[PDB]
Ligand binder design. Structure first.
Ligand SMILES: Nc1ncnc2c1ncn2[C@@H]1O[C@H](COP(=O)(O)O)[C@@H](O)[C@H]1O
Length: 147
C-alpha cells in the first residue's frame, strides 16, 4: 500500500508565487490547478481557484513580494478569513531562497507554505502531485496513513 489521506484538511484560500525565470504565468497556473485537483480527489477540501493569480518575482525581492502578496490577498478575503496555503515555485538550485522563504512564512507571516522545484513543474507527474498533496495535507492539519 502507498500512503493515503485519513483525514483531509481544508484549503479554501491559497496563492502562488513563482521565483523561476523558466516558468511563465500560465505554467504556474496549470501546475497549481493540477495540484489543487490532486489534493481534492485525495480527500481534501481544496478551492480550485487562488485568491489572486500567480505572480513572478526575483529571489532578491523575496521579502517584499511575500509581504505584499500576503497583504493584497488577505485584504481580498471576507473579514476574518485567512490564507491557508502559499505554493512557491523555486529554481532547482536556489541558494538562500528556500531558507529565507521559510523564515518569513514561519515567523513573520505565519502562513503554511509548500515549495515545488521547477523540474517537477515541467514534468507534473501524478506520483509527484500525490506526494505533494500528502505533504500539504499534514501542514494544514489533516492526517495521513503510515506504512
Ligand atoms: N535548500 C533547500 N532545502 C530543502 N529543500 C529544498 C531546498 N531548496 C529547494 N527544496 C525543495 O523543497 C521541497 C519541499 O518543500 P517544502 O515541503 O515546502 O519544505 C523538496 O522537494 C526540495 O527538493
Amino acid at each position: 500500500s502507498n500512503k493515503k489521506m485519513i483525514n483531509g484538511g481544508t484549503v479554501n484560500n491559497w496563492i502562488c508565487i513563482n521565483f523561476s525565470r523558466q516558468v511563465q504565468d500560465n505554467l504556474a497556473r496549470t501546475f497549481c490547478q493540477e495540484l489543487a485537483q490532486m489534493c481534492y480527489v485525495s480527500g481534501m477540501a481544496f478551492n480550485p481557484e487562488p485568491v489572486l493569480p500567480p505572480v513572478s518575482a526575483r529571489p532578491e525581492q523575496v521579502e517584499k513580494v511575500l509581504k505584499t502578496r500576503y497583504h493584497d490577498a488577505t485584504s481580498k478575503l471576507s473579514q476574518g478569513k485567512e490564507i491557508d496555503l502559499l505554493i512557491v515555485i523555486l529554481p532547482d538550485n536556489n541558494g538562500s531562497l528556500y531558507g529565507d522563504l521559510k523564515r518569513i512564512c514561519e515567523t513573520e507571516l505565519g502562513i503554511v507554505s509548500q515549495c515545488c522545484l521547477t523540474k517537477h513543474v515541467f514534468k507534473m507527474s501524478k506520483q509527484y502531485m500525490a506526494n505533494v498533496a500528502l505533504k500539504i495535507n499534514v501542514k494544514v492539519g489533516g492526517r495521513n496513513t503510515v506504512l
